[PDB]
Predict the structure.
Amino acid sequence: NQKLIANQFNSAIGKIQDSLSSTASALGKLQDVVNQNAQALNTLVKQLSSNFGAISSVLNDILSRLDPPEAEVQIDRLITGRLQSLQTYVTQQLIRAAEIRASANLAATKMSECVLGQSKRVDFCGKGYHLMSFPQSAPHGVVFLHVTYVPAQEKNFTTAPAICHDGKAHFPREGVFVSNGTHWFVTQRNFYEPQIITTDNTFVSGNCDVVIGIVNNTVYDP
Amino acid sequence: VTTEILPVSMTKTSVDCTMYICGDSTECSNLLLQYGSFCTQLNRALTGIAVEQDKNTQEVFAQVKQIYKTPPIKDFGGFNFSQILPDPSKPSKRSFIEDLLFNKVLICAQKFNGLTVLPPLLTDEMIAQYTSALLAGTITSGWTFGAGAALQIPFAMQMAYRFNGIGVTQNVLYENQKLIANQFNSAIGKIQDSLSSTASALGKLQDVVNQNAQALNTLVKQLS
Amino acid sequence: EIRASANLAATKMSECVLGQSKRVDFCGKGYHLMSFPQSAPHGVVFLHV
Amino acid sequence: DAVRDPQTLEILDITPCSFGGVSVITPGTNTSNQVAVLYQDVNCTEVPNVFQTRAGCLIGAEHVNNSYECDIPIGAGICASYQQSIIAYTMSLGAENSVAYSNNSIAIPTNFTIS
Ligand SMILES: *[C@@H]1O[C@H](CO)[C@@H](O[C@@H]2O[C@H](CO)[C@@H](O)[C@H](O)[C@H]2NC(C)=O)[C@H](O)[C@H]1NC(C)=O
Ligand SMILES: *[C@@H]1O[C@H](CO)[C@@H](O[C@@H]2O[C@H](CO)[C@@H](O)[C@H](O)[C@H]2NC(C)=O)[C@H](O)[C@H]1NC(C)=O
Ligand SMILES: *[C@@H]1O[C@H](CO)[C@@H](O[C@@H]2O[C@H](CO)[C@@H](O)[C@H](O)[C@H]2NC(C)=O)[C@H](O)[C@H]1NC(C)=O
Ligand SMILES: *[C@@H]1O[C@H](CO)[C@@H](O[C@@H]2O[C@H](CO)[C@@H](O)[C@H](O)[C@H]2NC(C)=O)[C@H](O)[C@H]1NC(C)=O
Ligand SMILES: *[C@@H]1O[C@H](CO)[C@@H](O[C@@H]2O[C@H](CO)[C@@H](O)[C@H](O)[C@H]2NC(C)=O)[C@H](O)[C@H]1NC(C)=O
Ligand SMILES: *[C@@H]1O[C@H](CO)[C@@H](O)[C@H](O)[C@H]1NC(C)=O
Ligand SMILES: *[C@@H]1O[C@H](CO)[C@@H](O)[C@H](O)[C@H]1NC(C)=O
Ligand SMILES: *[C@@H]1O[C@H](CO)[C@@H](O)[C@H](O)[C@H]1NC(C)=O
Ligand SMILES: *[C@@H]1O[C@H](CO)[C@@H](O)[C@H](O)[C@H]1NC(C)=O
Ligand SMILES: *[C@@H]1O[C@H](CO)[C@@H](O)[C@H](O)[C@H]1NC(C)=O
Ligand SMILES: *[C@@H]1O[C@H](CO)[C@@H](O)[C@H](O)[C@H]1NC(C)=O
């Protein structure tokens, strides 16, 4: 299916291109970080307009009107408030920075396990069976394009845990035993590809009196 | 069978900064404006937490696209799930084990100071439906439901795959299928009894509840 | 702290319930076969087999 | 939280007058200027399409028996959306799917897609 797979891949990439061109909210996770920091700074700057109990938010006005014995009292009120506002800002940035650090550590883990490898961790590198991923640069962040294999068209089959040939119990080595209603085949689990059951794709262990659900059929030995 | 307990969410408290500081007072409220945006950013910080708690719940439980259900005939190759599957005889469709967890793990006095508690977006009944779906999927389709459409598969065959995964051949499962089902069923019964008996088993969740309760009681007492 | 726990719980849901993990001591002590989630007050309980 | 009256020695309980947060539910102004208002943890008898829910008294949203995917969360299983007017509903957790499980039936994918 190499030609089909290449076409499905190329099509999926085109879908990403269009989805990003169309949907403004797609990068909300990065925009939210930008917005939180912008708000934090705007809040910090606006606090300079607060009096905090002082006669004026403007330090120059306090100093232009009052002499030190009085000016110091008014200034202390602004220092306390401005220092408190600045401490609040920094504390929020330390907590916020920790969240970003955690995200960056996750991103670094995905880079190593999704881009520089193939992951067997479910839903770690996208939804489906992970094949590969590609990093892309983004403002203050990374975007991963995860390429996954997803089972499609549907078919029901009859199955059995083992086949009884000469009274011995035969088990599939790699796949499962299936039936189309008349014939039994062995097939790989994630893709229907029926094969004749032979001694080269089964193994034998024990007899037919132990396996629950064992069925009678023929195992061929070329 | 090992029980692992993890916190997912925290109570979504909400504190009205002006009410807390200057409850029902115009003179105080006006003085509070001299402090600029301090109340706005405190209300914002708590709002952000509350939103996060709904997000935390959604990311843990809503991992299944469809709500899967088990068949009327629970033939799982000798494996018994009546303890972990829902038992619809009661209004909340929780499992027996879940009822134990729920039974094991003031508000007016706190509320009256501008301290409200917001309800979770997903109710306990909805969390139970998600876990039922995840569980029904796990039982009838193994892991395939987590990577696309759920395949049906006999439970014993699913177990065979899981045995292969750990480096043990398929015939070990089938040859010992009755023993394995008995050991499993017994282990589940042990969980049921352990939870019914040991109060401290859910200490990880109770500790979260206790820390938040202390935080609110401390906040309220500061008004004195 | 809760967010970190929730992220861990979400990871376990995906890797222990919607799959079979090869990560040692991630999905219980022993060789992981499968797990089952259970609802709990403000949390999740996993029964790891 | 209680006081003895100074003229008649009656014991009275004192509770605060009802209060709570007010949240405005809205589709963006790009779509509509119609809004619904939630009086959080307030009764619909205290506030003055009036729907009393666990989250509070929701006014302006029409309650329907049709569940949908969650749009604007209200709380306690209730979401609201603009579909025109604002409606409230119990959110759906997804479509139901009874899996065709049996002791001898396996489904096997015959095709795949690359996503
Ligand atoms: C099950 O699969 C077998 C093998 O493909 C089918 O048997 C073949 O049927 C075709 C006609 O469609 C014949 O031309 C071949 O000669 C048959 N092969 C053999 C070995 O007999 C069988 O019909 C399928 N059964 C069902 C119910 O679909
Ligand atoms: C699979 O084939 C064997 C024979 O190769 C069947 O064995 C018979 O079982 C019945 C029931 O106990 C006995 O009365 C017969 O005498 C057995 N025959 C022989 C030759 O021993 C077995 O039942 C078949 N299994 C299935 C599921 O069809
Ligand atoms: C699955 O296990 C449950 C118990 O967890 C079994 O139900 C119990 O059956 C015994 C009789 O053997 C009764 O005395 C108990 O009161 C029952 N408990 C409950 C909660 O109903 C159930 O029968 C088992 N299912 C199968 C197929 O074996
Ligand atoms: C493997 O260990 C299990 C126990 O974990 C054995 O099963 C027990 O066997 C004794 C007899 O010696 C019975 O009295 C118990 O009731 C059985 N327990 C269970 C759960 O069935 C099993 O026989 C051992 N297998 C081997 C090959 O040694
Ligand atoms: C597997 O599914 C793919 C689509 O994902 C099928 O490819 C399409 O086949 C139709 C004809 O029925 C064409 O019109 C489409 O243009 C094809 N799409 C692509 C991307 O090539 C493919 O034929 C299916 N394979 C099998 C064996 O059923
Ligand atoms: C499998 O059989 C069930 C009936 O038991 C049916 O509802 C389902 O759609 C079938 N699936 C396929 C792929 O044929
Ligand atoms: C499979 O299930 C059917 C009921 O649907 C039952 O009659 C049959 O005996 C079961 N097969 C085995 C091997 O238990
Ligand atoms: C005045 O207060 C006393 C308290 O002991 C009470 O007994 C009496 O009835 C009151 N008189 C009136 C007119 O309320
Ligand atoms: C928002 O309104 C603008 C017109 O000012 C329109 O071009 C745009 O498509 C609208 N977007 C949505 C999502 O309605
Ligand atoms: C609102 O008041 C009515 C009585 O008129 C009562 O039955 C109902 O439970 C109250 N609801 C809430 C949320 O308090
Ligand atoms: C939902 O249906 C019930 C009848 O089962 C009816 O009494 C109730 O008023 C309906 N609610 C809405 C919002 O339509």
Observations:
- DSSP finds ten helices and four strands in chain B.
- The first strand of chain B starts at residue 2 and ends at 7.
- The radius of gyration of chain B is 24 Å.
- Chain B touches chain D through 46 residues (CB under 8 Å).
